[PDB]
Design a protein around this ligand. Sequence first.
Ligand code: CA
Lengths: 185, 51
Amino acid sequence: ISGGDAIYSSTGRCSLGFNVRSGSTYYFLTAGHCTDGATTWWANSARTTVLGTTSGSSFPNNDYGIVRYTNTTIPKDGTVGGQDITSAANATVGMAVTRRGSTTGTHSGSVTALNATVNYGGGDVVYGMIRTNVCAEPGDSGGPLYSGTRAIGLTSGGSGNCSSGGTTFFQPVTEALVAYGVSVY
Amino acid sequence: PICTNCCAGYKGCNYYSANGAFICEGQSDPKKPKACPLNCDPHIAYSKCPR
Ligand SMILES: [Ca+2]
């Protein structure tokens, strides 16, 4: 399993962000709104292939969460589909980026603003988001935003769709990596 | 089933559970779309947009 693949739990379906580790212990990052209230994660809609258990969640304010792998046999590729990931970086306006998600696949665009505040309504407000002109649709949440081999962010939210165009917001990955003391590989 | 949430679903469409319980009417206006979280709500199985 890799960045952008589907992940299922009691909270519904989201996308895996990045496969990360701490020494020899593996986890995956995804959106905090997806981990909020979830316990077990499965790799299939039948919910028969276990992935792991939620270990942290930060939403709203931020939008990041981490799941500890409990399944020793599933491949845990440090990639986004075919694209290998080697390090993490901060976004800059003008950066060419690609996002992968379990609903829409792979779409490209650029970072158009930094530090955006986004009101999802209902008292859910997030800060410090990366704003882009990449489209995304429901199911894409938690998917990776990357630039070449650098991990940049986790899909948080957006408006519009991959047929007409949209605006998508991302939680900078560096902030979650630092918060949990893990790294991409 | 479908993958949507009350935020991202469309104004004018009703979303229901697999058992037929009305869950919500969508909140997004195709013309003036709002920012929404992008997860699939586990409770919505289908929708109907009355005409
Ligand atoms: Ca890698």
